[PDB]
């Protein structure tokens, strides 16, 4: 039978500075369209978009992932767990016209990396060479996690993504960005105080704030805080589990380690299912707009 091997072919005649022009184009529009989602910005939605495309991977048959970038097709475009990601898609649509040489897999992945760095997050090395694939390789619906589950569902789903407990608790710290939307997923409320600033508040307000299991306007049960915060069940289960809590408390008292652990885990997340040759260059580390004088 053998599994699928997705080899990474770098774009013909494309250097580090060429992808840096795509980063700057993304990072600038993040600054221009500042009023989106009540002045949250496209920052958070571009991170979630990057994860969902990398979350369809399955290490058992090497299907899905960010390699093919098959989000252009209507199959995985209208998944019930993908509602609201169209805004990040049409956010990158004019950018894909400005640089028609880039692959959709690289654009979708670069958008999430760009958002984390521009939201004052850790630098995330990034590789190129993702290739576009036809429609018959579009992953089916349901390869993404459910919001109303337990910590056992958390650990079991991320084994399919080949990520241990430390990498999972790291990637969850990104959920302090943005907001849940009733019209999209059935949960309402913001995640944290800084909507578009990458901090370890996800671990702080989870251990410091007081949470009560309330009921929203969609008959769904969510954990609400006394300060206005809210998470979904699959999230709050991290403290119900003792092994996750030992990592939650570590990231809450030491942000520097949460930043270093997030980069490796989030880069691994975006590179899952991609076979790189030995001629491939070192992963790029782009410059943020602030480091470029802006």
């Amino acid at each position: 039978t053998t599994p699928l091997v997705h080899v990474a072919s770098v774009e013909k005649g494309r250097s580090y500075e060429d992808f840096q022009k795509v980063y700057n184009a993304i990072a600038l529009k993040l600054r221009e369209d500042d009023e989106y989602d009540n002045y949250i910005g496209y920052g958070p939605v571009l991170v979630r978009l990057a994860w969902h495309i990398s979350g369809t991977w399955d290490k058992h048959d090497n299907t899905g992932g960010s390699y093919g970038g098959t989000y252009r097709f209507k199959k995985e475009f209208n998944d019930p767990s993908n509602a609201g990601l169209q805004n990040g898609f049409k956010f990158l649509e004019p950018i894909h016209k400005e640089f028609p040489w880039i692959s959709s897999g690289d654009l979708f992945s670069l958008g999430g990396v760009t958002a984390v760095q521009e939201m004052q997050g850790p630098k995330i090395p990034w590789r190129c060479g993702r290739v576009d694939t036809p429609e018959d390789t579009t992953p089916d619906n349901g390869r993404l996690p459910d919001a109303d589950k337990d910590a056992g569902y958390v650990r079991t789903f991320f084994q399919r993504l080949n990520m241990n407990d430390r990498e999972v608790v790291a990637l969850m710290g990104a959920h302090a960005l943005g907001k849940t939307h009733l019209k999209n997923s059935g949960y309402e409320g913001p995640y944290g105080a800084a909507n578009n600033v990458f901090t370890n508040e996800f671990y702080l307000n989870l251990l410091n704030e007081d949470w009560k299991l309330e009921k929203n306007d969609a008959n769904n049960e969510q954990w609400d805080s006394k300060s206005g915060y809210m998470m979904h069940p699959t999230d709050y289960s991290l403290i119900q589990d003792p092994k996750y809590l030992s990592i939650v408390k570590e990231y809450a008292n030491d942000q520097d380690k949460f930043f270093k652990d997030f980069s490796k885990a989030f880069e691994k997340l975006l590179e899952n299912g991609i076979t790189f040759p030995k001629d491939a260059p070192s992963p790029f580390i782009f410059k943020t707009l602030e480091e470029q004088g802006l």
Binding site: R31, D34, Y39, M119, A193, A194, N195, V197, E201, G228
Partner: protein, 103 residues
């Protein structure tokens, strides 16, 4: 500036931390009542950071624009996790809104 659009900016990018009223809610950030002369911070039991306490700076219109353009650049090590008002039109719209609610 425009004091009516500054109500929108403050409700979307500041109200989840600060409240310009009369009490001392201190949600995440300190209260911003009477921002005319405070230099570094205020003494109300609110645990500030030694970042803004250093080298007292009077809160004037011209220097808060520097603070709201890039917070950590203006004060290295500040606990305020904020992206910044990268535009000057809405930076004048917001500071106009603050000064009217400090009586």
């Amino acid at each position: 500036g425009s004091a009516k659009k500054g109500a929108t900016l403050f409700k979307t990018r500041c109200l989840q931390c600060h409240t310009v009223e009369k009490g001392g809610p201190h949600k995440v950030g300190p209260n911003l009542h009477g921002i005319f002369g405070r230099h570094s911070g205020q003494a109300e039991g609110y645990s500030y950071t030694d970042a803004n306490i250093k080298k007292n700076v009077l809160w004037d219109e011209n220097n808060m624009s520097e603070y709201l353009t890039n917070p950590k650049k203006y004060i290295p090590g500040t606990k305020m996790a904020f992206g910044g008002l990268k535009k000057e039109k809405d930076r004048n719209d917001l500071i106009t809104y603050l000064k009217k609610a400090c009586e």
